[PDB]
Write a protein that binds this ligand. Structure first.
Ligand code: ZN
Lengths: 51, 283, 304, 320
């Protein structure tokens, strides 16, 4: 189970580094939809049909 | 007092199944109001008329009258507000999801809401209802977009369709879950709704855990949580990616990408955009 | 409730205080105004009715064969109908001599006529329950109904300071409009003839009235031949004319399905005096039937 | 002594364009047909074209033969041809500024009709000496006559603004800079050419058609004022559908007698308002007149006034 130790180490450390200060934009931040001016990028089509 | 009467004469003709006559009568009357610039009267008459055609399963007539309504909305410069949108919501309810013109009708409604509000992409509350209709017609990708641009309730509905869709997939995998999950993270990051990004992630990952029992441990630091998966590196990347975007710190973004070289390639376009939006990476 | 080709419901209505009659161009307007007034007075003996003309041609005096004017006079032979003939342009012009915005002229003109009516009720102790307004054939006399809206927008955008005057005038008109837009208090009966130009002008009038939020669902169609039915089929000229009239009657029936479309016969001798006017007027209340009622019409012509 | 007929017009050798117009079922098409026939009969050495732009195909109905986009001789005439077109349909078969600027739509439409005429002459269909234009009942088809003035004032405003600037910004802004302006000036020049002839009273006139009734009289005064504002010559009025009831009680019951009374009232008004016009008073015929034979018999009263005492037999012979 702990064979994924390498990636666990990285996640652990990275999370600590990032959360050392309050992230600039807080979790509850929402850009007012009135101000939203573009979509970002099309995501790929899924191979699976929806039914 | 006269308006109530002509709408009764009309709904008599509709109970009788005289749909051509009903449509004819209403059009004469509506036209006269439109011609005399009596727009409130036309709006009430037309909308009511459209409603009873739809209730009577006369899709063609009802849809035509919805377009007529939108024409008058545009003519009378009807601004997006609660009453304006409610007329359309009440109509969307009666629309058969199979109507051949569904997408046109919805685009008509949305386009009015763009022109007469300050939303580039249209009123969110309207989007919530439109989304649901589209999904009834199996127009999944269109529903996704409208929900994305919707309300809190739309976010819940968005998670539900995606979750239902993942469950429909016969051959589950490691990369499969991420194909669906990544859509919430990316889309809500694209519109900078961090709150919906977090909340959708939470709902989705909890359901994933409760159904598939993956191996995981919750890592918690300063009030933030990463669900560390043993077999879903994709999922780790996507969670850390979100928090990275919140910080707007290029070095964290770089660290994150350097660790997950494959995901950096896989999400190349998405990451270039996030780098621009959150970072400052314009070329 | 299916819409009867007569004015019965209006004639016996107890709620209407203002009945307007209008129509452009030799369409039997004055006869129609007079006939509506007579029918209402006869059907409602307990109420007092005023028939007022703002035509300068003194048309009501001509129609009844008595001299009417600025002072209300009972028509001889009636206990409950009075007539007035005024000229509001002339009344304004004398007032103005004694020294940009649409609807003003018309507002001040119509306030004058209201003033005169109210004054006439005061000085004779008889207040009128309903006024039948025979409107002037030319001009847009009710255009002032749009004023409160035009002027309210003007005030937002905003020597003698006229703002107070403007607001008072807005308030004055809004008071009128409250009653003129109430379908139970006020309605407009259109008068026309079964011909292309008249039908076109009637559609215009109706649209004008709808834009004022004035109730309109009555159309009197005059001068109908009913030529197939009289007998003495002699007159193929009349038969050909009837054919054309039927064409436009069909158009009216389809355009104004929800209106009271009342179809009135042509009478050879133009109808004058109380007696002839009441006999003819009855067909506003109960439809003329050419088969059965022809002899009534011929009596009038026969009498000359 | 301005004569109550169209004799001087009918025998005129100078007119190339005769317009006929009137709103509201006033006998317009019969009047156009009658004018064309009278001119053709009185001037056998000339070739005449009667053209309708009414989509109802009224001339085909009036003569009882099928006419269309291609000029056809009316059967029984050596000298008269008929055309029926639709300029809206011709234009569609052939943009914001057409809506923005008044007269443009009408200019391009009318240039199309003239183009079609000229082509029809050219492909061995004879050159026509005079065209009788049965105008469409609706719209302001000659509004283009105002265009050269509207457009000239627009080019001055264009000349004031553009020549303010540059030439850095002027040359950047101008790809095809002269081009759109070239097109406007060409169109202005095209219309001014037409106007030169349409405002020439010896080349062009408009005959109004009406009935002796209040609304028609009112619309006719409006029409006349419209034509004066285009500088179009107008001094002919045909008044149709007159009963002259006092002169045949046999055909004229008291209903008709009463109607005639009313008609006389408006005839008197016309006589006083249009003292200097040729006011031609035409009799009602009960049966609407169709075919060359009936149309030529009736049409003669445009040239020499109908007299109800003397000519009544001619009219009552068409009725049966
Ligand atoms: Zn007759």
């Amino acid at each position: 189970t702990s064979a994924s130790g390498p990636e666990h180490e990285f996640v652990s450390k990275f999370l600590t580094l990032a959360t050392l200060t309050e992230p600039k934009l807080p979790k509850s931040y929402t850009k007012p939809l009135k101000d939203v001016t573009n979509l970002g990028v099309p995501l790929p089509t899924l191979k699976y049909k929806y039914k | 007092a006269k308006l109530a009467k002509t709408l009764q004469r009309f709904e008599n003709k509709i109970k009788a199944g005289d749909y051509y006559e009903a449509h004819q009568t209403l059009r004469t009357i509506a036209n006269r109001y439109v011609r005399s610039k009596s727009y409130e009267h036309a709006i009430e008459l037309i909308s009511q008329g459209a409603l009873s055609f739809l209730k009577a399963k006369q899709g063609g007539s009802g849809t035509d009258l919805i377009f007529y309504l939108l024409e008058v909305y545009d003519l009378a410069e009807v601004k997006v507000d609660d009453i304006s949108v409610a007329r359309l919501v009440r109509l969307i309810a009666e629309l058969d999801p199979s109507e051949p013109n569904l997408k046109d009708v919805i685009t008509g409604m949305n386009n009015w809401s763009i022109k007469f509000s300050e939303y580039k992409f249209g009123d969110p509350y309207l989007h919530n209802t439109i989304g649901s209709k589209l999904l009834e017609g199996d127009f999944v990708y269109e529903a996704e977009r409208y929900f994305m641009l919707g309300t809190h309730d739309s976010m819940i509905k968005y998670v539900d369709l995606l979750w239902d869709w993942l469950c429909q997939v016969d051959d589950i995998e490691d990369s499969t879950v991420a194909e669906f999950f990544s859509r919430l993270v990316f889309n809500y990051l694209f519109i900078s709704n961090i709150s919906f990004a977090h909340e959708s992630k939470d709902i989705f990952l909890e359901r994933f855990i409760e159904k598939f029992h993956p191996k995981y441990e919750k890592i918690d630091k300063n009030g933030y949580e990463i669900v560390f998966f043993e077999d879903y590196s994709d999922l780790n990347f996507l969670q850390l990616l979100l928090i990275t975007c919140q910080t707007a710190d290029a070095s964290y973004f770089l660290n994150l990408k350097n660790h997950y070289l494959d995901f950096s390639q896989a999400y190349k376009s998405e990451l270039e955009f996030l780098g621009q939006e959150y970072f400052n990476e314009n070329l | 409730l299916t819409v009867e080709p007569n004015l019965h419901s209006l004639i016996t209505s107890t709620t209407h205080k203002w009945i307007f009659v209008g129509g452009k161009g030799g369409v039997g307007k004055t006869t129609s105004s007079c006939s509506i007034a007579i029918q209402m007075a006869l059907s409602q003996p307990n109420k007092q009715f005023l028939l007022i003309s703002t035509d300068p041609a003194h048309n009501l005096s001509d129609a009844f064969g008595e001299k009417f004017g600025k002072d209300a006079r009972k028509v001889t032979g009636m206990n409950n109908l009075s007539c007035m003939e005024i000229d509001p342009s002339a009344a304004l012009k004398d007032m103005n001599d004694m020294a940009s915005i649409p609807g003003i002229d018309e507002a001040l003109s119509f306030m004058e006529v209201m003033k005169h009516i109210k004054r006439q009720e005061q000085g004779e102790g008889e207040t009128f329950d309903t006024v039948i307004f025979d409107t002037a054939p030319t001009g847009h006399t009710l255009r002032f109904l749009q004023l409160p809206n035009t002027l309210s927008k003007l005030l937002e955008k905003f020597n003698v300071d006229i703002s107070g005057k403007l607001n008072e005038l807005k308030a004055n008109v809004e008071t009128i409009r409250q009653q003129f837009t109430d379908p139970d208090l006020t309605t407009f009966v259109c008068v026309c003839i079964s011909e292309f130009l008249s039908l076109y002008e009637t559609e215009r009038l109706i649209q004008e009235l709808i834009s004022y939020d004035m109730d309109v669902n009555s159309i009197i169609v005059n001068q109908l031949l009913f030529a197939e039915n009289d007998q003495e089929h002699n007159c193929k000229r009349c038969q050909a004319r009837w054919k054309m009239q039927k064409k436009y009657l069909d158009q009216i029936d389809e355009l104004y399905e929800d209106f009271h479309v009342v179809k009135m016969p042509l009478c050879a001798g133009e109808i004058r005096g109380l007696n002839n006017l009441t006999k003819f007027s009855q067909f506003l209340n109960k439809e003329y039937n050419p088969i059965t009622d022809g002899k009534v019409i011929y009596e009038l012509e026969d009498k000359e």
